[PDB]
Design a protein around this nucleic acid. Sequence first.
DNA 1: AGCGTGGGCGT
DNA 2: TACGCCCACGC
Length: 86
Amino acid sequence: ERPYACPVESCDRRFSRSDELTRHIRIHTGQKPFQCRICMRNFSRSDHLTTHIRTHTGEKPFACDICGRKFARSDERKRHTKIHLR
DNA sequence: AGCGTGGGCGT
DNA sequence: TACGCCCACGC
Ligand SMILES: [Zn+2]
Ligand SMILES: [Zn+2]
Ligand SMILES: [Zn+2]
């Protein structure tokens, strides 16, 4: 499977979904359609723009279950929680 | 630590 | 196709 192959020369990436290839090809086109209004930096992806903006606002939605420490991203919290192991 | 950013995916 | 999650890697 993975019928959607990248057609850029030296690239061998292949994908299961059409939209995956369309997203991937932005690495080659350099297209960064999503701009931060605060610092004007451009981003390849809407979801990464959203987490980037928390760097300006200080928004930290994700609290550790053990100690309550807050993080901008779920994966930051995930990396953190395991420090509480023995 | 703080966070850029691609892949896989559900919707 | 978009939107926005988790996941993972990288610095
Ligand atoms: Zn490619
Ligand atoms: Zn910004
Ligand atoms: Zn904690």
